[PDB]
Design a binder for this molecule. Structure first.
Ligand SMILES: CC(C)c1nn(C)cc1-c1nc2ncc(Br)cc2[nH]1
Length: 289
């Protein structure tokens, strides 16, 4: 720790955000710390701040990942990092604020139609081509990780559990990600590539279609056991999805990762043609219904 704080000091911006930020508000909680929002006194713009405790982590060297990998990264479809700091015993990551909030709130309250679902998927997949291109694996994809703007635009967040691969470190080995949405290989402790993200995406479609992931009402521990062992889960209500949507999902939920489609490929699948403008998501959002 003594040494690990010293390292993180050298990757983050020096100084204290409290100097420029006012009026902090907890708005959330992930598995590693909390999420606040805050106002920048000059200008008055809003920012989100992720705050993680250095002493309160399982596997902290993980904490290294977003700050190192995802600094200076930019995309229409990624939530932007501004800076990062250490505040006492915490890591603070200051990020772009998203008004629309999370997709979770939508999938758990309405029935996204096909057009809308495709629009989420294209947004996610655009993002994911470029990420994997660079050998970056998000490793915690799910509706939780999808954030919206006031006008319906989709951006991917929660890179706290992301990973880097290269020519020399080709695949990864650690159990991260979130259990219901984790991939078979990853559970079975295999080396894994980006392709794990693609599986997790599929589970997101089940989220979008059936309102929650497979094996949900189970204990987390047993769900993994199940996810590992059985056949690819399919929809509770099949009769409700287009053949377009099926074939597509059937490219995502593939147990053998070498045959599971690449985002690159998925960016072309006829389904996504159905996607509709950012403004077609708008009425799904809490403050409209
Ligand atoms: C509680 C969360 C889902 C939320 N609600 N609303 C209205 C906005 C948000 C939210 N927007 C966010 N933008 C960036 C980060 Br990092 C976290 C964010 N959380």
């Amino acid at each position: 720790h003594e040494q690990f704080r010293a390292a993180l000091q050298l990757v983050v911006d020096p100084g204290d955000p409290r100097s420029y930020l006012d009026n902090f508000i907890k708005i959330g909680e992930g598995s590693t710390g909390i999420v606040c929002i805050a106002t920048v006194r000059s200008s008055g713009k809003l920012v989100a701040v992720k705050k993680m405790d250095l002493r309160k982590q399982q596997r902290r060297e993980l904490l290294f990942n977003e700050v190192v990998i995802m600094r200076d990264y930019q995309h229409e479809n990624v939530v932007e990092m501004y800076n990062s700091y250490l505040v006492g015993d915490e890591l603070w990551v200051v990020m772009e604020f998203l008004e629309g909030g999370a997709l979770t709130d939508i999938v758990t309250h309405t029935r996204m139609n096909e057009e809308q679902i495709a629009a989420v998927c294209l947004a996610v997949l655009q993002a994911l081509s470029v990420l994997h291109a660079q050998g970056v694996i998000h490793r915690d994809i799910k509706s939780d990780s999808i954030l919206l703007t006031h006008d319906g635009r989709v951006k991917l967040s929660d890179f706290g559990f992301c990973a880097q691969v290269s020519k020399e470190v080709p695949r990864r080995k650690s159990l991260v990600g979130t259990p219901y949405w984790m991939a078979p290989e990853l559970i079975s402790r295999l080396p894994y590539g980006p392709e794990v993200d693609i599986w997790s995406l599929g589970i997101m479609v089940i989220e979008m279609v059936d309102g929650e992931p497979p094996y949900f009402n189970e204990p987390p521990l047993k769900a993994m056991k199940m996810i590992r062992d059985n056949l690819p889960p399919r929809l509770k209500n099949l009769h409700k999805v287009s053949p377009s949507l099926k074939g597509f999902l059937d490219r995502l939920l593939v147990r053998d990762p070498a045959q599971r489609a690449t985002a690159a490929e998925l960016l072309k699948h006829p389904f996504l043609a159905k996607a509709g403008p950012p403004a077609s998501i708008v009425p799904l959002m809490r403050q409209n219904r």
